Symmetry: C2
Subunit: 199 residues, 2 copies
């Protein structure tokens, strides 16, 4: 198939798809958009947002849906419906968490924003990350089913983005950091990290 | 297995799971939580929220994940991974739409303003696209055939209609999809026995 990814010129929600396509070892166009050109491109997307992955000429959006699809293609999904449920539930929970990051990112009042960041760093992150940490510990060192999934790749690629703001944030969570080191050293993901544009 | 669904005593995000369990034709305990008891129950849930579906005692959360799981068990998912992507992408987009709703649900004059953006901007942006998608793709959200996404979509829209009675009336293909789904025998039977 042909693959063309459109996203902004940073990691964000494009990166899970880039990592999955790299893991899949397929060529793909990495179409990156500057923030300056976004009001132009916005009206061209199916629902006004990126990422968009064009597969054999058909535009598909939603980072999670696409990651799962590529995960199936990659052999990084479940062996049965229950195993896929174990992956899906963790990523939907992660996406509930990262909604908090989005609220903080889009706040225009600086003092409120500082208040969101405080709540985020001292209540929200511990609440979710202690559970994620305990879950990974008790699930074989992975998000789900004791084995590598597209969920692990989605989780780590997006957490890496957080490390660009709060650099130490995942360090104290031993099992999150252990999954992080494992994923970024998958050879094709490692390669992508080495060759990817480094803003 | 045994199934126990815990959610509040209204439709909301529990209703897609109730509809899917009904469509699956399996017995389940419909554990409907009153707001008064929610502070007690909240700490017992995996991540502080409902719905929670207990499957032979194991707690699973996340309404979309559960609906997809039950969808696959019910023969209402895709025939291949492309077809499953077609369902999954529409529902994640619908969940983006829903996210705008959730903020309203969370001062009665600032509520009145959030509600004007929802009805006047957010709803028309999304529902025009959903309506035309359904129109030009066989009368369903994905792949020209009934999926768990249709169930999820219509059940949550039905709950939105209990607040904004005319919200889908101008979207004739959405309304038509609604009418198809709620007249499915297993669904219809649920709608008749559920709390008023
Ligand atoms: N649920 C969507 C969220 C996509 C999304 O939020 N895209 C943002 C960038 S991360 C965007 O397009 N912002 C530009 C805008 O909203 O105009 C997904 O997971 O792909
Ligand atoms: N992504 C979750 C969202 C769950 C959610 O937002 N649950 C709300 C009710 S619809 C809740 O439990 N509110 C009570 C609380 O947060 O204390 C899902 O789809 O199940």
């Amino acid at each position: 198939p042909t693959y063309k990814l459109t996203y902004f010129n940073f990691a964000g929600l494009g990166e899970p798809i880039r990592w999955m396509l790299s893991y899949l070892d397929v060529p793909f166009e990495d179409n990156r958009i500057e923030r300056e050109q976004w009001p132009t491109i916005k009206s061209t997307t199916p629902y006004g947002q990126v990422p968009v992955l064009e597969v054999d000429g058909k535009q598909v959006c939603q980072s999670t849906a696409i990651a799962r699809y590529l995960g199936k293609k990659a052999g990084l999904a479940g062996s049965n419906e229950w195993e896929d449920l174990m992956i899906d539930t963790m990523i939907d929970t992660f996406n509930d968490f990262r909604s908090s990051i989005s609220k903080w990112f889009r706040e225009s009042d600086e003092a409120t924003k500082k208040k969101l960041e405080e709540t985020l760093l001292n209540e929200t992150v511990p609440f979710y990350f202690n559970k994620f940490n305990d879950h990974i510990k008790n699930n074989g060192g992975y998000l789900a089913n004791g084995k590598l999934s597209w969920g692990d790749i989605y989780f780590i690629s997006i957490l890496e983005f957080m490390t660009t703001i709060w650099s130490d944030i995942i360090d104290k969570y031993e099992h999150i950091k252990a999954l992080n080191d494992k994923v970024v050293n998958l050879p094709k993901i490692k390669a992508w990290i080495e060759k990817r544009p480094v803003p």
